């Protein structure tokens, strides 16, 4: 993990960073005795392995707004801790793989097209989807489920098109038996994400996108946890007669 | 480690605090890879087991000067990592102990009063003095020193005076083979801190004070990485024709 900056911006974002926090010290008395649980609470997330948790869900919305700046496509959404590369290939009308358990809940099916800025349909395109199962747990972070559980790589047609059928995300609570939780628990919080799948979509020239799914009228909407749920990216899926959620969503990306 | 925090003052904080990085963030478009390179280094922070390293150079700093603002007493410093609780007690006049290697240095003779706040000397008075060797190092934070190398609890004469003599303390550098100093490194800082010894002044009744001294043009005096040094805490030696260095400094406690 490398980036390019200069000793000069280190310093000048380190020095703001400093100067906030101890900014924030000043202004509500913080004490020794907070102080030490500060110190205590940071060495075990560290222990808990939950840095990847605790930024993804406290601070990646404001890095996402960062890009979000300089993208013309469609809105994009924290990348949560849970991204796994290489999901395995799907055609462009797919199921992703689950288990019989998954198959007890109602089939979400997403279709739409990948396109550019001006609404041309992109062949060689890619759709990374990922998302929890009803029980809130994704592949490869519970040792029970199959390591490519409801993750996949879907190719798009020659126009761009894709048909994906998965089950009906569900919301997902953050682990909390944890410092994560702990910190969530002892501010009287709740540690509750909407419902939500994760997306990676790609095209040869193009910018990459990094986004989110919601589901209107879904619980924790308006008060999502990692504060990365957008209105552009809440679906409104209709049920067909065979009972089955329905919903089309293109995604516009920039050039790279 | 235990504060009795509420709920709704740990919500006021955390919202400040991680509005507070949050605006950093969005302030100098911090980008993907440097976020990534941010959660890396968290990591390596506490792998490193430099929670209290960091957090006492880059943050202690503020919340000593929160408690400066209710004590009418010595102005107090911050402890740093390396305070131990029960140094083994030495008379109201002493030596503090150290190696033949330490005996080479110029002494340091060291004398003072605790009084009160209306300037009466105080009996039943101690003086937990620490401080680093000629070499940087602190006992027990080092496998070659004794483990009570320049650490002790003077106890203060009936009219509350003292007498210890030491060696001069000399700059120390901060660790910086792990994640601080890669820190300091990357925006092109010192790890220095000037010459210094650390000191928690008690007495029955008062509030305790924690706090430092550092000496007259020493360097890195008015750069300090842990922001620490006072000018009210600068001591002026004079060295004697013996060729010790003496100094006179009392300390005044507030009521507890
Ligand atoms: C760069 C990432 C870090 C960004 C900082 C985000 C803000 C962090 C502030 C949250 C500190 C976490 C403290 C919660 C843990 C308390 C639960 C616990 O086990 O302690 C308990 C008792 O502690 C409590 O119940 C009260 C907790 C609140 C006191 C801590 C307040 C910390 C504020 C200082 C941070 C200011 C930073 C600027 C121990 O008994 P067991
Ligand atoms: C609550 C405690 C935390 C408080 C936050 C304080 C500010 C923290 C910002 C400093 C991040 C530390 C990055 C320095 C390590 C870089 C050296 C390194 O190994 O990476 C190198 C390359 O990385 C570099 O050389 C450039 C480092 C600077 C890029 C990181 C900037 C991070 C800014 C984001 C933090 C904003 C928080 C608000 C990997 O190659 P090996
Ligand atoms: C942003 C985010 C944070 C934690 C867990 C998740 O599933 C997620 O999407
Ligand atoms: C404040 C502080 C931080 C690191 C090392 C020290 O010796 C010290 O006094
Ligand atoms: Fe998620
Ligand atoms: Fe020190």
Same mark, same amino acid.
């Given at each position: 993990?490398?980036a390019? @900056?200069?000793? #000069?911006?280190?310093?000048?974002?380190?020095?703001?960073?400093?100067?906030?926090?101890?900014?924030?010290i000043? /202004?509500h008395?913080? @004490?020794?005795?907070?102080?030490?649980?500060?110190?205590?609470?940071?060495?075990?997330?560290?222990?808990?392995?939950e840095?990847?948790?605790?930024?993804?869900?406290?601070?990646?919305? *404001?890095?996402?707004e960062?890009?979000?700046?300089?993208?013309?496509?469609?809105?994009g959404?924290?990348?949560?801790?849970?991204?796994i590369?290489?999901?395995?290939?799907?055609?462009?009308?797919?199921?992703?793989?689950?288990?019989?358990?998954? #198959?007890?809940? %109602?089939?979400?099916?997403?279709?739409?097209?990948?396109?550019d800025?001006? $609404?041309?349909? +992109? &062949?060689? &395109?890619?759709? =990374?989807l990922?998302?929890?199962?009803?029980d809130?747990?994704? *592949?490869?972070?519970?040792?029970?489920?199959?390591?490519?559980? +409801?993750?996949g790589?879907?190719?798009?047609? =020659?126009?761009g098109?894709y048909?994906?059928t998965?089950?009906?995300?569900? !919301?997902?609570?953050?682990?909390?038996? $944890?410092?994560?939780?702990?910190?969530?628990?002892?501010?009287?919080?709740?540690?509750?994400?909407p419902?939500? +799948?994760?997306?990676?979509? *790609?095209?040869?020239?193009?910018?990459?996108? %990094? @986004?989110?799914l919601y589901?209107?009228?879904?619980?924790?909407?308006?008060?999502?946890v990692?504060?990365?749920?957008? !209105? =552009?990216?809440?679906?409104? !899926?209709?049920?067909?007669?065979?009972? /089955?959620?329905?919903?089309?969503?293109?995604?516009?990306?920039?050039?790279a």
């Amino acid at each position: 993990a490398t980036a390019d @900056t200069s000793p #000069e911006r280190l310093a000048a974002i380190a020095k703001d960073a400093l100067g906030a926090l101890n900014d924030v010290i000043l /202004k509500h008395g913080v @004490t020794y005795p907070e102080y030490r649980v500060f110190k205590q609470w940071l060495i075990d997330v560290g222990e808990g392995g939950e840095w990847p948790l605790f930024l993804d869900v406290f601070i990646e919305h *404001s890095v996402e707004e960062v890009l979000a700046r300089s993208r013309k496509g469609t809105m994009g959404s924290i990348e949560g801790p849970y991204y796994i590369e290489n999901s395995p290939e799907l055609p462009s009308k797919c199921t992703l793989p689950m288990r019989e358990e998954d #198959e007890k809940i %109602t089939p979400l099916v997403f279709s739409g097209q990948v396109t550019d800025l001006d $609404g041309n349909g +992109l &062949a060689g &395109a890619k759709v =990374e989807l990922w998302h929890a199962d009803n029980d809130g747990y994704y *592949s490869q972070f519970a040792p029970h489920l199959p390591e490519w559980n +409801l993750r996949g790589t879907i190719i798009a047609d =020659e126009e761009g098109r894709y048909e994906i059928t998965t089950i009906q995300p569900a !919301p997902y609570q953050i682990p909390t038996d $944890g410092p994560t939780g702990q910190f969530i628990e002892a501010q009287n919080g709740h540690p509750w994400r909407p419902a939500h +799948l994760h997306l990676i979509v *790609s095209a040869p020239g193009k910018e990459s996108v %990094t @986004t989110q799914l919601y589901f209107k009228g879904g619980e924790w909407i308006d008060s999502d946890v990692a504060s990365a749920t957008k !209105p =552009e990216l809440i679906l409104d !899926p209709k049920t067909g007669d065979d009972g /089955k959620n329905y919903v089309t969503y293109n995604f516009v990306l920039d050039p790279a």
